[PDB]
PDB file of C-alpha atoms and ligand atoms in Angstrom:
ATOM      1  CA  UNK Z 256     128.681 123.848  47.238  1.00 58.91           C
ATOM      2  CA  UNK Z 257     129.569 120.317  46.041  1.00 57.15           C
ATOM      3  CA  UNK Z 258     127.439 118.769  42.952  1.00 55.12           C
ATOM      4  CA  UNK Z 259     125.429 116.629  45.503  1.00 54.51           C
ATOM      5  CA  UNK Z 260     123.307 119.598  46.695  1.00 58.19           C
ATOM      6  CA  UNK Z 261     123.144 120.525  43.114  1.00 57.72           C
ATOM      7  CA  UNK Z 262     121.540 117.518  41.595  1.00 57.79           C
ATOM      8  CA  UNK Z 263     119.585 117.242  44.542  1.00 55.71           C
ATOM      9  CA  UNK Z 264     118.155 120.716  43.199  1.00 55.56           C
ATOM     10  CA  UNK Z 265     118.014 118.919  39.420  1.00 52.36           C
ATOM     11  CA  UNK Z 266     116.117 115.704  41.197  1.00 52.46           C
ATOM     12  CA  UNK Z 267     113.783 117.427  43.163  1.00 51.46           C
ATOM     13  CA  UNK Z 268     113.212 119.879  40.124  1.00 52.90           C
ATOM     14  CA  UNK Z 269     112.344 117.068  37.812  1.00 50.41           C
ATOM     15  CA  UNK Z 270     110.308 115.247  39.962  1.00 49.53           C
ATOM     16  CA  UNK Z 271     107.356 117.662  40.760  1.00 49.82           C
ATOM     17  CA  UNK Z 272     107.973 119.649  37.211  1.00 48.42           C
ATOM     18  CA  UNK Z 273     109.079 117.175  34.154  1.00 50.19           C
ATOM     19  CA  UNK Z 274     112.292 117.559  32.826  1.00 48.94           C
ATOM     20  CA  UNK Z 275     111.718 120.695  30.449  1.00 50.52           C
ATOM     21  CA  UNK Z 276     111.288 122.595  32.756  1.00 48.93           C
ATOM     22  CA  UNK Z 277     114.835 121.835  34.754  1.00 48.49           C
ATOM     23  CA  UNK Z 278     116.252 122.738  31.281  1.00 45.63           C
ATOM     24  CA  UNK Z 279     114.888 126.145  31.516  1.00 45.58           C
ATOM     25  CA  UNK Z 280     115.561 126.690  34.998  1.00 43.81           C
ATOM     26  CA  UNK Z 281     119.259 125.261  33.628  1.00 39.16           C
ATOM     27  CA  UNK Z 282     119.672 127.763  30.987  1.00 39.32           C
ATOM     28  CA  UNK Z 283     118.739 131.359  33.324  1.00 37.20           C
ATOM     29  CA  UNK Z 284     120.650 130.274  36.249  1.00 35.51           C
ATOM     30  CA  UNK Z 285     123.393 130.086  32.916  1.00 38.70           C
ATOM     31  CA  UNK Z 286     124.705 126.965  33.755  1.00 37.60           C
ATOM     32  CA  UNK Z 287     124.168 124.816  29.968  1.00 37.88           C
ATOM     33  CA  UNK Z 288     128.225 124.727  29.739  1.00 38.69           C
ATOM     34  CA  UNK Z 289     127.539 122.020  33.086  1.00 36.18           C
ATOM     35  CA  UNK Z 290     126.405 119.065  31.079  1.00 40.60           C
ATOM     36  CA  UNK Z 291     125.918 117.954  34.546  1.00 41.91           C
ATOM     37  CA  UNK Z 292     126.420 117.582  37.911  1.00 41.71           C
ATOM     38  CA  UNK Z 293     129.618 115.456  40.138  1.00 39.31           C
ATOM     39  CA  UNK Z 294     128.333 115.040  43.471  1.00 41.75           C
ATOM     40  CA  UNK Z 295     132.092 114.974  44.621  1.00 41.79           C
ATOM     41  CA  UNK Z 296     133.164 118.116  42.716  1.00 38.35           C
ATOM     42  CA  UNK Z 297     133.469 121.241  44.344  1.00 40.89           C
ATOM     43  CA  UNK Z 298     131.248 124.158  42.328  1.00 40.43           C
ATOM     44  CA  UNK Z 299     131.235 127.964  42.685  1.00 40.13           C
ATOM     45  CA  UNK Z 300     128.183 128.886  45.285  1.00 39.71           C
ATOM     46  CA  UNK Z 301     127.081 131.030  42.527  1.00 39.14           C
ATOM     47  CA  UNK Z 302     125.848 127.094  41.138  1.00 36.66           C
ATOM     48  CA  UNK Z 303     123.232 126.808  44.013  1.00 36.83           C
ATOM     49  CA  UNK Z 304     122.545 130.331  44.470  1.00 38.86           C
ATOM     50  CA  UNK Z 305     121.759 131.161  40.685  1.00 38.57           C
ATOM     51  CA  UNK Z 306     119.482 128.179  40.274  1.00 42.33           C
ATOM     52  CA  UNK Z 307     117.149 128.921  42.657  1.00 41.41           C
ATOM     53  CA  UNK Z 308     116.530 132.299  41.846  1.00 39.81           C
ATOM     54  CA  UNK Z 309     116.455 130.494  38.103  1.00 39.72           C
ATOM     55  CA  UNK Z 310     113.711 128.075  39.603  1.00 40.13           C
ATOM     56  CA  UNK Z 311     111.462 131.142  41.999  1.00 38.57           C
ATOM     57  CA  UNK Z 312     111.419 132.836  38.545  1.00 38.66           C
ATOM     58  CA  UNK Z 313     110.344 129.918  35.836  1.00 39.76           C
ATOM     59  CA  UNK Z 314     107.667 128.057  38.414  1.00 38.08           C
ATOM     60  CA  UNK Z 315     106.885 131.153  40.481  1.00 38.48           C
ATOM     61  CA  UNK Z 316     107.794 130.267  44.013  1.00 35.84           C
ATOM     62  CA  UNK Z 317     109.756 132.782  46.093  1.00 35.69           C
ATOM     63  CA  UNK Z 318     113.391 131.521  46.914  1.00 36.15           C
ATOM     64  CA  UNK Z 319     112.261 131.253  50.671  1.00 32.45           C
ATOM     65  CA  UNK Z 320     109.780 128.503  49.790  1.00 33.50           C
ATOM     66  CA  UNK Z 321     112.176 126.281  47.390  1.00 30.54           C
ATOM     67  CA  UNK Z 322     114.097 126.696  49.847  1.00 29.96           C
ATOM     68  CA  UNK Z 323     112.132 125.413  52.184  1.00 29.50           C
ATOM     69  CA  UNK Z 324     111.289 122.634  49.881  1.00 28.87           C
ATOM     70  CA  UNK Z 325     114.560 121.813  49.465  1.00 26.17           C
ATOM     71  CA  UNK Z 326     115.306 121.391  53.249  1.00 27.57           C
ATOM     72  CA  UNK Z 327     113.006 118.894  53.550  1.00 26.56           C
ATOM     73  CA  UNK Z 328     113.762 116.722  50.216  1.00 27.35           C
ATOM     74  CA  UNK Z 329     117.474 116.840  51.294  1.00 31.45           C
ATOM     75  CA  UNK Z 330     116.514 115.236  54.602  1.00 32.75           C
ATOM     76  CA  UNK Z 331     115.301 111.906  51.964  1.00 33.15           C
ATOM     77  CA  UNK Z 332     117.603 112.558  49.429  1.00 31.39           C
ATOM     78  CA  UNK Z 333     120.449 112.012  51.467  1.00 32.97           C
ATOM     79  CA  UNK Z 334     119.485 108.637  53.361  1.00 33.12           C
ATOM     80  CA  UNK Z 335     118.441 107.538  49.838  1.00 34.18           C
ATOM     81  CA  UNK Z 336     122.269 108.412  48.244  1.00 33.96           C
ATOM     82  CA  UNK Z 337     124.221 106.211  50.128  1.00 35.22           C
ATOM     83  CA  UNK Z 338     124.553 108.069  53.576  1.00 36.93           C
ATOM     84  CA  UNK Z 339     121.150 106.857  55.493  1.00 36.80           C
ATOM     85  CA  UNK Z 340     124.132 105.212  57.694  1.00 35.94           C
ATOM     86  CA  UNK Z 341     125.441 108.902  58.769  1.00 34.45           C
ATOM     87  CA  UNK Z 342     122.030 109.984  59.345  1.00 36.66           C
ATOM     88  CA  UNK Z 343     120.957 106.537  61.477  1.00 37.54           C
ATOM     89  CA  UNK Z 344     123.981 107.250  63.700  1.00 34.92           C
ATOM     90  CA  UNK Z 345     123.433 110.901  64.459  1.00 32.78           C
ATOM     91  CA  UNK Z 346     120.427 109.489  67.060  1.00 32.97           C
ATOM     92  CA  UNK Z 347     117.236 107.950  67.772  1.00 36.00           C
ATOM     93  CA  UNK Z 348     115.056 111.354  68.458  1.00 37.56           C
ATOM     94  CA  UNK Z 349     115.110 114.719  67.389  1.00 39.70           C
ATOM     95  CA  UNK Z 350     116.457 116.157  70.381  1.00 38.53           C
ATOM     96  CA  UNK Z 351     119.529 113.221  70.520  1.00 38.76           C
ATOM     97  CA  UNK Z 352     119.855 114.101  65.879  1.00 35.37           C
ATOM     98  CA  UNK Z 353     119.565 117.552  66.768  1.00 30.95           C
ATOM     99  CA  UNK Z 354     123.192 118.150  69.528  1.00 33.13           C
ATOM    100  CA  UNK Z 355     125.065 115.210  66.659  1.00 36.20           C
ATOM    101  CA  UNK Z 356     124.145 117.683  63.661  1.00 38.22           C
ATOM    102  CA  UNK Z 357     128.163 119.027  63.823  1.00 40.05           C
ATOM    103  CA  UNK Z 358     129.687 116.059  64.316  1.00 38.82           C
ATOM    104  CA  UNK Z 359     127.430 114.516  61.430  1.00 36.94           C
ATOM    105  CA  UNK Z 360     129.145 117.196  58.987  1.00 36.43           C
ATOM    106  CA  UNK Z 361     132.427 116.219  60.549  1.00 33.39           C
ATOM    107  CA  UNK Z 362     131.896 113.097  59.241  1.00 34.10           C
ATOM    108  CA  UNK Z 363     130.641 113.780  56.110  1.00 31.15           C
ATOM    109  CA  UNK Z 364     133.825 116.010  55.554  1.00 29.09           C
ATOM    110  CA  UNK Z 365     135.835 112.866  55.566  1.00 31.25           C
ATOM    111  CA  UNK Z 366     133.820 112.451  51.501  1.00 34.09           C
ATOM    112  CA  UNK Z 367     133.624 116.017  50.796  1.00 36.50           C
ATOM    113  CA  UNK Z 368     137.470 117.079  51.949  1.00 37.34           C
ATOM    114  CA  UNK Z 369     135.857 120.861  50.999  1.00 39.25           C
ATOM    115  CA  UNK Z 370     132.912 120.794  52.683  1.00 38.55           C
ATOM    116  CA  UNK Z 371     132.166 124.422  54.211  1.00 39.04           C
ATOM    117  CA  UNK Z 372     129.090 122.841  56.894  1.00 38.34           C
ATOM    118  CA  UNK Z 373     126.858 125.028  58.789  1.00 38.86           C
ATOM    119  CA  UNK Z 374     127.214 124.415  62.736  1.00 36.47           C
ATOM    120  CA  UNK Z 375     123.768 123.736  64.834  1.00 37.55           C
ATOM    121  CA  UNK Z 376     123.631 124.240  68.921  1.00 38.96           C
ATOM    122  CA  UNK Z 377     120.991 122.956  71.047  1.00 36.29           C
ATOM    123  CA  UNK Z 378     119.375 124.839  74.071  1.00 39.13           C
ATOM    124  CA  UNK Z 379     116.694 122.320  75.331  1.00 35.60           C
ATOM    125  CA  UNK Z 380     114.167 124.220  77.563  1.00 34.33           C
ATOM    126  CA  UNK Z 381     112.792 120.662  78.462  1.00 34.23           C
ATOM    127  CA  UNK Z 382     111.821 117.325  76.321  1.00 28.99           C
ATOM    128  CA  UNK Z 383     108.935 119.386  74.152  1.00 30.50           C
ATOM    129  CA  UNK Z 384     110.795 122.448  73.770  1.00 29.71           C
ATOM    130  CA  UNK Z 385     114.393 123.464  72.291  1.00 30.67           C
ATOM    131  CA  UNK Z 386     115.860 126.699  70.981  1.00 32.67           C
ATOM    132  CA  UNK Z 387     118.446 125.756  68.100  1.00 35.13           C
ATOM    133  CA  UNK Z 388     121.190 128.285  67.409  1.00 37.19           C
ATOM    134  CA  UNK Z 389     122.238 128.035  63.478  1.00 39.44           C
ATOM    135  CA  UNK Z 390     125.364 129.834  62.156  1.00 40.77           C
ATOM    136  CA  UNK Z 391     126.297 129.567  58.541  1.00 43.22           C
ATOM    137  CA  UNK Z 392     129.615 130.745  56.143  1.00 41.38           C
ATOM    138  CA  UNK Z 393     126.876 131.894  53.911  1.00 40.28           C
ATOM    139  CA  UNK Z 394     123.824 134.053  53.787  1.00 42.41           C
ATOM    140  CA  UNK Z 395     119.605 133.269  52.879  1.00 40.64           C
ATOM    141  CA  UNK Z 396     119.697 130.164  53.712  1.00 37.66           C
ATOM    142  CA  UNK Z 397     117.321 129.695  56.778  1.00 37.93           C
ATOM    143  CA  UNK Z 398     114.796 128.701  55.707  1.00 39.21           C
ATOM    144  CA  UNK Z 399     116.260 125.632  54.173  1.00 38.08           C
ATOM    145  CA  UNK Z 400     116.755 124.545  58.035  1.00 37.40           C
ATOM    146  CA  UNK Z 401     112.956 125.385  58.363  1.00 34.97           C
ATOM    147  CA  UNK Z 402     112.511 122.875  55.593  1.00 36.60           C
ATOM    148  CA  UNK Z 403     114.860 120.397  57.212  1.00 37.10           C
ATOM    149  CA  UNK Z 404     113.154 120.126  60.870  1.00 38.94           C
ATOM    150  CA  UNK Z 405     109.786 119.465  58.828  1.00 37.67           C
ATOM    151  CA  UNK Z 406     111.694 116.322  57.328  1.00 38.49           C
ATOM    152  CA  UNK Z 407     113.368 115.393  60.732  1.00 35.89           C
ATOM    153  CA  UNK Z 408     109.769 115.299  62.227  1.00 35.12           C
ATOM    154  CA  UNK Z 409     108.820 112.925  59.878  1.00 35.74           C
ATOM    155  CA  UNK Z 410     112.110 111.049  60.402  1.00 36.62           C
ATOM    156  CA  UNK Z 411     111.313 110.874  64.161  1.00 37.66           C
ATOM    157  CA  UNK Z 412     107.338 110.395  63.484  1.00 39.07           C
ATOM    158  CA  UNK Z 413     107.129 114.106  65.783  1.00 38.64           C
ATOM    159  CA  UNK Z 414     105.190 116.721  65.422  1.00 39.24           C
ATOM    160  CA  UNK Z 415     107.323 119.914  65.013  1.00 40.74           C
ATOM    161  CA  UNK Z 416     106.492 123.035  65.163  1.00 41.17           C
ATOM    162  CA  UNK Z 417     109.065 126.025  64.358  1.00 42.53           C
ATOM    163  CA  UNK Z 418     108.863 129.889  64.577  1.00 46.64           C
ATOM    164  CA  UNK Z 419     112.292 131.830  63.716  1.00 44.99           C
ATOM    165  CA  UNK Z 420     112.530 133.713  67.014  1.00 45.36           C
ATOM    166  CA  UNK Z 421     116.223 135.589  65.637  1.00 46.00           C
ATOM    167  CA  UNK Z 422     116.891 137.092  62.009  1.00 44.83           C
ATOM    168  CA  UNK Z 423     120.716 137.310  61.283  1.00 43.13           C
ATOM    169  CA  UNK Z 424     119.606 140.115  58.810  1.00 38.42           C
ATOM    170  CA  UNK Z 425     118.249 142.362  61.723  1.00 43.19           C
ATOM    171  CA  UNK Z 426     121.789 142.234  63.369  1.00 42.74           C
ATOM    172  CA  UNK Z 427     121.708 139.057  65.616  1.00 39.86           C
ATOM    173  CA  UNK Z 428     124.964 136.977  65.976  1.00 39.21           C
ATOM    174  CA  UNK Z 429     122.733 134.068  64.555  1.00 40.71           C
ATOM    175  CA  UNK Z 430     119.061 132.718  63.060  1.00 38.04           C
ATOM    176  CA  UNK Z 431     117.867 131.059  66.325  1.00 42.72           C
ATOM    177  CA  UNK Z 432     115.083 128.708  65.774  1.00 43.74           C
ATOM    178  CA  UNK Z 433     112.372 127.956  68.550  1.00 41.13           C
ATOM    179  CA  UNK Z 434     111.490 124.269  68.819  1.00 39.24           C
ATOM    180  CA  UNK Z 435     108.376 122.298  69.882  1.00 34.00           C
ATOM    181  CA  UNK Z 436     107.949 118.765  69.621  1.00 31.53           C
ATOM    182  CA  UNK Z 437     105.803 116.688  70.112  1.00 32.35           C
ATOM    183  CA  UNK Z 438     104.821 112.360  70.004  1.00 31.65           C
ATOM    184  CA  UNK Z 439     102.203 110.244  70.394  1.00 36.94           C
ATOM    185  CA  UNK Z 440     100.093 112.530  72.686  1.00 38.51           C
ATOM    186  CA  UNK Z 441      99.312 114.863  69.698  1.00 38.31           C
ATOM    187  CA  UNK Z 442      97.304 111.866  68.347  1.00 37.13           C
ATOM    188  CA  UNK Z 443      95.773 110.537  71.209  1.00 37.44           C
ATOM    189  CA  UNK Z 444      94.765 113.704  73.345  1.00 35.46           C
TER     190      UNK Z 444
HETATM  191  C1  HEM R 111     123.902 112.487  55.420  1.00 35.83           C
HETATM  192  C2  HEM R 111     123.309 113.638  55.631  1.00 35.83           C
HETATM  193  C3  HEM R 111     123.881 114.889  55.059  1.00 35.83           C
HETATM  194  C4  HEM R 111     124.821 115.120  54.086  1.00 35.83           C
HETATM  195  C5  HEM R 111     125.584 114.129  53.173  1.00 35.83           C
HETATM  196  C6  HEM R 111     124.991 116.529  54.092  1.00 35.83           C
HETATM  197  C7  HEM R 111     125.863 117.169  53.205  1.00 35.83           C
HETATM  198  C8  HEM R 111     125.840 118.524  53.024  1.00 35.83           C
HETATM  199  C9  HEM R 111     126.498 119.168  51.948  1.00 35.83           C
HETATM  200  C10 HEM R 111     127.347 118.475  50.875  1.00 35.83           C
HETATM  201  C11 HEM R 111     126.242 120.504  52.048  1.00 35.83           C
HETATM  202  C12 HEM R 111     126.769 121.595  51.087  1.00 35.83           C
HETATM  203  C13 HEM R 111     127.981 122.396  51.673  1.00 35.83           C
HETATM  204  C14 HEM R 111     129.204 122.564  50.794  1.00 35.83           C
HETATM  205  O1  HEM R 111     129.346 121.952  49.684  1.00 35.83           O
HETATM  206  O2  HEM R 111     130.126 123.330  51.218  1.00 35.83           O
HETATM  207  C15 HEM R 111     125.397 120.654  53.175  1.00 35.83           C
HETATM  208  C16 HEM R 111     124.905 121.877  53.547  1.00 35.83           C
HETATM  209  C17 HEM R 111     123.988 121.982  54.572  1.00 35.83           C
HETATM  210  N1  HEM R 111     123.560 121.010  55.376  1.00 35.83           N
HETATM  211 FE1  HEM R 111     124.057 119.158  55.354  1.00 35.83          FE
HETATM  212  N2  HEM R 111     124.188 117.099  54.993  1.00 35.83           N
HETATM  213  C18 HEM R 111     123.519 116.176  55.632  1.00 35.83           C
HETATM  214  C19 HEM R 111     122.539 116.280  56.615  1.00 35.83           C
HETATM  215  C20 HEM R 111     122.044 117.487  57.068  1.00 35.83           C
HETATM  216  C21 HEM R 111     121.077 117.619  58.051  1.00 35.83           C
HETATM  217  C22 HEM R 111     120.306 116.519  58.721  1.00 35.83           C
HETATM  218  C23 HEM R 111     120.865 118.942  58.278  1.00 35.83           C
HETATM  219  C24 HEM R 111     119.826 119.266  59.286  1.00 35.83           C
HETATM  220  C25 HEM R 111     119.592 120.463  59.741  1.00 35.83           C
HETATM  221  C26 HEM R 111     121.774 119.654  57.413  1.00 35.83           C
HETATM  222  C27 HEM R 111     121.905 120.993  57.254  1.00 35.83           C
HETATM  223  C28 HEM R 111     122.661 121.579  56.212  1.00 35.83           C
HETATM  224  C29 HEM R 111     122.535 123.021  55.909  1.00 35.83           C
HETATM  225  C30 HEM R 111     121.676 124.029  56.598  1.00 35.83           C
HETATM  226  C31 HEM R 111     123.360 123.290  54.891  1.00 35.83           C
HETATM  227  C32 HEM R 111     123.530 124.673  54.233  1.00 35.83           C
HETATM  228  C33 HEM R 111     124.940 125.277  54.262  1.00 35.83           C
HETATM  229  C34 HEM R 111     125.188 126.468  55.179  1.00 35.83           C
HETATM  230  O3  HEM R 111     124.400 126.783  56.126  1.00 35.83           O
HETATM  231  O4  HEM R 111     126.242 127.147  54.995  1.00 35.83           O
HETATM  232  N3  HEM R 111     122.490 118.723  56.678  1.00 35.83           N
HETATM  233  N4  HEM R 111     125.170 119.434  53.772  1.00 35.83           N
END
């Protein structure tokens, strides 16, 4: 994946845990040789994938929740790196952010010319509800995007919550995600 989502994995690493720590993670994932990370260069997969089993195994968190961590940091890191314009554009609301999510990645292909995106469909069952269909190049990741809708609800000030209704590793097409959302009456009511 390019270096972006690998420092990303170094910054949130050496936030919550010091930087010693990173440079253990560093050295099981074998990855020392990488003084460190160009956002804009193209790794190996093996990078991302080899670090986090590198980071479950030094701090003792299963993959599933650095992953789902991650999804959420990535959500902040981004807007923070220079592409809060991308994610202002993609909509006003979660469900509006939510149908843009391809055409987001389109654009951020433009940067990254070898950009391999995931692609996002949304079934809204009404304006509380949505299903969202995710279908990935790659494998494991899901729960990053569990990760992710947790930081979009904070984006959009929602309340979100998410149950994995299809498992890709059960034999289903795609992870399908079930959606509610909700505003202000959460609060009030
Ligand atoms: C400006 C905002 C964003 C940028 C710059 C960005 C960029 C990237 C990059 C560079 C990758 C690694 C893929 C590769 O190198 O081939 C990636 C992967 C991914 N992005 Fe985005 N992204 C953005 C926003 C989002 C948002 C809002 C979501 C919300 C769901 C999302 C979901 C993902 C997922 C799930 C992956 C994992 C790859 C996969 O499934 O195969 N991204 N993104």
């Amino acid at each position: 994946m390019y270096g972006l989502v690998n420092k990303a994995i170094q910054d949130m690493i050496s936030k919550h845990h010091g930087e010693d720590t990173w440079e253990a993670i560093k050295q099981k994932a074998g990855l020392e040789d990488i003084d460190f990370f160009v956002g804009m260069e193209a790794y190996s997969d093996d990078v991302t994938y080899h670090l986090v089993g590198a980071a479950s195994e030094v701090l003792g968190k299963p993959a599933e929740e650095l992953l789902i961590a991650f999804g959420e940091y990535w959500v902040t890191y981004t807007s923070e790196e220079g592409y809060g314009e991308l994610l202002a554009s993609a909509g006003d609301s979660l469900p509006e952010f939510m149908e843009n999510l391809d055409n987001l990645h389109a654009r951020v292909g433009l940067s990254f010319p070898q950009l391999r995106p995931p692609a996002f469909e949304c079934q809204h069952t009404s304006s509380k509800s949505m299903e969202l269909h995710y279908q990935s190049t790659r494998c494991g990741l899901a729960p990053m995007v569990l990760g992710l809708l947790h930081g979009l609800g904070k984006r959009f000030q929602t309340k979100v919550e998410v149950t994995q209704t299809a498992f890709r590793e059960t034999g289903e097409d795609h992870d399908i995600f079930s959606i509610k959302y909700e505003g202000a009456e959460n609060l009030y009511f």
